[PDB]
Amino acid sequence: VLSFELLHAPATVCGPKKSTNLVKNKCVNFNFNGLTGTGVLTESNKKFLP
Amino acid sequence: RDLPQGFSALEPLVDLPIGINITRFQTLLALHRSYLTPGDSSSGWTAGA
């Protein structure tokens, strides 16, 4: 018996999984981590902080 | 002695979803137990720099 809980506490056990491939140089919809937009994706030389 | 005149940003380390209620604050230190201050915690206690 796997018992869930419904209360005012944040969810601990999660994980949406899901997977689709990546394309480039084509106008396409993206939903990386909640953010959504339309455009083309190209390689960029800018360096991010870790 | 004293904090030097300078600037330095602080980078995140961890994020905790614990969500408990926090109200009080205390700090731990290292206690030197040896022959100088033997016995129980009543006498075996030093400050240190």
UniProtKB/Swiss-Prot annotation, chain B:
<comment type="function">
    <text>Attaches the virion to the cell membrane by interacting with host receptor, initiating the infection. The major receptor is host ACE2. When S2/S2' has been cleaved, binding to the receptor triggers direct fusion at the cell membrane. When S2/S2' has not been cleaved, binding to the receptor results in internalization of the virus by endocytosis using host TFRC and GRM2 and leading to fusion of the virion membrane with the host endosomal membrane. Alternatively, may use NRP1/NRP2 and integrin as entry receptors.</text>
</comment>
<comment type="subunit">
    <text>Binds to host ACE2. RBD also interacts with the N-linked glycan on 'Asn-90' of ACE2. Cleavage of S generates a polybasic C-terminal sequence on S1 that binds to host Neuropilin-1 (NRP1) and Neuropilin-2 (NRP2) receptors. Interacts with host integrin alpha-5/beta-1 (ITGA5:ITGB1) and with ACE2 in complex with integrin alpha-5/beta-1 (ITGA5:ITGB1). May interact via cytoplasmic c-terminus with M protein. May interact (via N-terminus) with host bilirubin and biliverdin, thereby preventing antibody binding to the SARS-CoV-2 spike NTD via an allosteric mechanism.</text>
</comment>
<feature type="region of interest" description="Disordered">
    <location>
        <begin position="33"/>
        <end position="49"/>
    </location>
</feature>
<protein>
    <recommendedName>
        <fullName>Spike protein S1</fullName>
    </recommendedName>
</protein>
<feature type="glycosylation site" description="N-linked (GlcNAc...) (high mannose) asparagine; by host">
    <location>
        <position position="21"/>
    </location>
</feature>
